[PDB]
Amino acid sequence: TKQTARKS
Amino acid sequence: GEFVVEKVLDRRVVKGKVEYLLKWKGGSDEDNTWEPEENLDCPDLIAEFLQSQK
User: Fold this and answer.
1) Nearest CB to A4; choose among B4, B33, B36
2) CA nearest to B6 within chain A
3) What CATH number does residue B1 fall under?
4) DSSP letters along B9-43, please?
5) B35 in contact with chain A, both atoms CB, cutoff 8 A
6) Which has fewest Cβ within 10 Å: A6, B24, B29, B42?
């Protein structure tokens, strides 16, 4: 699956 | 915003939150950022890193 993350 | 992650590099705890050092796709080593685990939607990359400690 797509490896994503939110960036603060 | 939400970006694609290339690799998880490290792990730490800061102010009671688990954080992971992320290498962003398209970004360089200067672009690495620590993000709390709630920000992360890359379980495959998290597990690969943790398995890679030992």
Assistant:
1) B4
2) A3
3) 2.40.50.40
4) EEEEEETTEEEEEEEETT--GGG-EEEEGGGEE-H
5) yes
6) B29
Q: Are B30 and B23 in contact (CB under 8 A)?
A: no
The range of the structural domain enclosing residue B5 comes to 1-54
Decide if B41 and A3 are in contact by the 8 Å CB cutoff: yes
| Number of folded domains that form chain B | 1
Question: Nominal resolution in Å?
Answer: 2.1
Q: In 3D, which of B25, B27, B18, B26 has the Cα closest to residue B50?
A: B18
List the determination method.
Answer: X-ray
The residues near B44 (Cβ < 8 Å, ≥ 6 apart) are A1, A3
| Contacting residues of B for A6, CB less than 8 Å apart | 1-2, 35, 39-41
